[PDB]
Amino acid sequence: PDFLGHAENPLREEEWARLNETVIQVARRSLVGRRILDIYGPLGAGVQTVPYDEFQGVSPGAVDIVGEQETAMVFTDARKFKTIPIIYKDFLLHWRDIEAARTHNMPLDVSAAAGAAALCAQQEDELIFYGDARLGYEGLMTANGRLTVPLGDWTSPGGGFQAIVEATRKLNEQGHFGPYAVVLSPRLYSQLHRIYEKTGVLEIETIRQLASDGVYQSNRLRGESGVVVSTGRENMDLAVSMDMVAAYLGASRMNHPFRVLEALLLRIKHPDAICTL
Amino acid sequence: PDFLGHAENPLREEEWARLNETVIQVARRSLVGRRILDIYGPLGAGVQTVPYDEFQGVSPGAVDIVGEQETAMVFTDARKFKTIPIIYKDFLLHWRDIEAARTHNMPLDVSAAAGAAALCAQQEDELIFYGDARLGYEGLMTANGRLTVPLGDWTSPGGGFQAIVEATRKLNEQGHFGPYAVVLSPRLYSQLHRIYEKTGVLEIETIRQLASDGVYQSNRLRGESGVVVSTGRENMDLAVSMDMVAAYLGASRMNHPFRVLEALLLRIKHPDAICTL
Amino acid sequence: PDFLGHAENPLREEEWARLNETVIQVARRSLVGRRILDIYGPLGAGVQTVPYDEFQGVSPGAVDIVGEQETAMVFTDARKFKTIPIIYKDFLLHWRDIEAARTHNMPLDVSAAAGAAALCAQQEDELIFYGDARLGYEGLMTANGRLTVPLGDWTSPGGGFQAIVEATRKLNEQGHFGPYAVVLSPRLYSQLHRIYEKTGVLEIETIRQLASDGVYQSNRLRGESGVVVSTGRENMDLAVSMDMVAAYLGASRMNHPFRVLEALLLRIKHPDAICTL
Amino acid sequence: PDFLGHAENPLREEEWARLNETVIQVARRSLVGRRILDIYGPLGAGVQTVPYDEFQG
Amino acid sequence: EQGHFGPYAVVLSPRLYSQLHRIYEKTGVLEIETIRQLASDGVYQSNRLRGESGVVV
């Protein structure tokens, strides 16, 4: 077992069960992008592909008995699924370590495992909020349908407010409404949280009651925030192939390399819910 | 049993079970440093040693299929574990006492037991927040990686705010983010809680919504506070060998000496999350 | 067929048994530092750590019966155990040959293995006799408590007699005495191989009868230096975690790489027993 | 429960046997004054007193 | 210096060996015992080596 190899999953079932638990704990807490959108069902590793395009658009029904049509409801003119990514951040455990834990010490050191997961899940959000274009994907800086609201006009004192109202109005128009979520760069959040004159009241209290879903801060959004959405289903979906898991590079040098595998793809099924600054 | 000795654990199982319960109750409520950092697993008394150094540093992944490397993820250049401390505050119970309780009175007097635990757990925090250098340890006044923010500029009225924003900014930069916790000396806390002009609003309300984890007060931090951290795992870990327990000096003079044994060591796995005034 | 691969154990149980036998044989012949100090017990690779310090240290007291008064001895002082190194010398076995040995030839050759182990164990001794600034060690040149004698090993016929005699003087005087062992540079040994001396017999007879545990030659010691110690245990211990073994790197581009793994750490628990030139 | 010490004889019979053996090893090696005079026989802790003493002829 | 050390063997032309066998070394006793201890694997004589040369390995 020191010798070595192969396929021991060099841990044991107990340490192995822990390794999974530690990774999913730290990852789920450091993911800010799974809280703004309710997740899709796990698709398994069998699928390479996530369903793609909808909406456009909006006509309603009265009615009584017969006499109601558009609809179809189409299902929108376009295919096929652009393959769900594989993103990973790897880690190794050292020579003795684990096997030192199988002789004397009952605790297994997860120090690198969770640390990688926190870093990996982080960039996962970078994949979502930014554009990508490497693999030629969407997210929202690129979704269009924004009618390019300038938002902003957030300088100094006086508030600090008007942007989100401009957003709700524009969001409301065109026929898409729901409970709204707002994402900001930390730098704006503080700049609006401040310079109570001081007369004074707070920025957080006014936005959080207006948004009515919540307000979130991501480190990965572009310095000039930001994006407002509508949490409603069949608008955006976070399509998850595999969750956070522990995987093995499997052998390197008298060591063990691990990776954390996350396949998440976010698809825009309704790009009218998106507005940037 | 009056006579005496030895190894009676001179209490009985019922009184003994209580003694444990009383100690852990008062200790857990008076410990402010286990609430700012999620605990490690108990390592048992078998181990003398706590794992030591990580991070430095931060590079992300895209990706698709093959083609993603740094990583390793190293596991950082340095060993070995600097032995987890034994800290204790002792107490005695008197001559008759306990045995008076085994004849007539059903309640056992825990007055000294819990009192010692409250005092012992207190200094335990002193071990954590200050430097030590007796046993040559870390904690945060000594962690470095602060880029020495001056923080402060907290005098008078007007707020009262800017320090924590300077902190979040600097914290945010360099590539480490999370939910943040803020620790202060009681003296600052009141000085900022006050001198609403009065126009007026509160200090507590603005910081507590910004920190987004919580704000805590310790009596043991240096008079000029303070330290801001990131609660995220694989950043700091409170490594617990043994919890709070009742132990016996075992015999002294027609009495019984007790001690409360606590072995807690806090390791800094990511000293970029630390900023002092 | 072969197949190809990555399931081995490139050998079979017999050849594998051979390689192990060959390596420890040649390594043991090339190890001069395990013959001057009796080994510690095997701790397995399970332990990462070997206990480090004693003495220094105080002599006095007795009166009659109670106290008057001491000590509490020592401990002495601080910890932890400086992790036992894992040293390696690597070699590859080349492609097909092994599988030619699976049918065609009965003898499997050693491209390196006996040679690498010979190279590795030797370098291990260089680790033992010299110090290492690299990771935290005690050599036999850095331990202090050396009271360096004005060398010895002259040209003139008395020569090394006076030297080892002077060594025993101060060694004994420091308040530490026992059976002695002497280690010399080969060049010193030949210049000290006498010629003639006292007219009864030669130098080997006088030194071997004086130190009286043995006389040894190492090539890894400094050419000018030579060292005297006391073989008695609980003074020095040669701490061996894992012995010398053949280990597997695994499948590579195409090759079978091996390494020889040796973990040896020497601790000086009473550094009054060391004397240099 | 456990955590040992009052204690008992906190070593065990094997470990205890070692400690005794080690002591006589290092002590007999470090005693130079029992080699120049043949020792008296052990009397046990029962005696407080060692036979004595004459001279001059 | 080349970074190669080990147990040494010395091979000489027979003509060298006797010239070296030799006398007392004035310190001194024989060449054989002093060399045999330096190379310390052995000292050997072959006739087929060149007369002036000799080699250590």
Curated annotation (Swiss-Prot), chains A, B, C:
One of its GO terms (biological process) is intracellular iron ion homeostasis. The keyword Amino-acid biosynthesis does not apply. Disruption phenotype: Does not form fruiting bodies. Decreased survival when grown under oxidative stress (0.5 mM H2O2). Transmembrane segments: none annotated. GO terms for cellular component: encapsulin nanocompartment. Keywords: Encapsulin nanocompartment, Ion transport, Iron, Iron storage, Iron transport, Transport. The encapsulin and a cargo construct (an encB-encC-encD fusion) can be overexpressed in E.coli and in human HEK293T cells. In HEK293T in the presence of 0.5 M ferrous ammonium sulfate nanocompartments can be detected and used as cell markers. Coexpression of this nanocompartment with a larger nanocompartment from Q.thermotolerans (AC A0A0F5HPP7) allows expression of different sized iron-rich particles. The encapsulin shell proteins do not seem to mix. The keyword DNA damage does not apply. Signal peptide: none annotated. It is found in: Encapsulin nanocompartment. Induction: Part of the MXAN_3553-MXAN_3554-MXAN_3555-encA operon. Expression is induced by amino acid starvation (at protein level). Not present in spores (at protein level). PANTHER family: PEPTIDASE U56 FAMILY, TYPE 1 ENCAPSULIN SHELL PROTEIN. Belongs to the encapsulin family. Family 1 subfamily. Shows substantial structural similarity to gp5 of the HK97 viral capsid, and while the sequence homology is weak, it suggests this protein may have evolved from a viral capsid protein. Has 3 domains; a discontinuous peripheral domain (P), an elongated loop (E) and the discontinuous axial domain (A). This is Type 1 encapsulin shell protein EncA.
Curated annotation (Swiss-Prot), chain D:
The chain holds residues 2 to 58 of 287 of the full protein. The 32 nm encapsulin nanocompartment is formed by 180 subunits; monomers form pentamers which assemble to form shells. There are 36 pores where the pentamers meet as well as 3-fold axis channels and dimer channels. The N-terminus of the protein is inside the shell. Induction: Part of the MXAN_3553-MXAN_3554-MXAN_3555-encA operon. Expression is induced by amino acid starvation (at protein level). Not present in spores (at protein level). Shell component of a type 1, iron-storage encapsulin nanocompartment. Encapsulin nanocompartments are 32 nm in diameter with an iron- and phosphorus-rich core (4Fe:1P) about 24 nm in diameter. Upon expression in E.coli most particles are 32 nm, 20% are 18 nm. The core is filled with an average of 14 dense granules, 5-6 nm in diameter that are not evenly distributed. Each nanocompartment is estimated to hold 30,000-35,000 Fe atoms. The minor proteins EncB, EncC and EncD probably lie against the interior face of the nanocompartment. Disruption phenotype: Does not form fruiting bodies. Decreased survival when grown under oxidative stress (0.5 mM H2O2). The gene is encA. It comes from Myxococcus xanthus (strain DK1622). This is Type 1 encapsulin shell protein EncA. Belongs to the encapsulin family. Family 1 subfamily. It is found in: Encapsulin nanocompartment. Has 3 domains; a discontinuous peripheral domain (P), an elongated loop (E) and the discontinuous axial domain (A). The encapsulin and a cargo construct (an encB-encC-encD fusion) can be overexpressed in E.coli and in human HEK293T cells. In HEK293T in the presence of 0.5 M ferrous ammonium sulfate nanocompartments can be detected and used as cell markers. Coexpression of this nanocompartment with a larger nanocompartment from Q.thermotolerans (AC A0A0F5HPP7) allows expression of different sized iron-rich particles. The encapsulin shell proteins do not seem to mix.
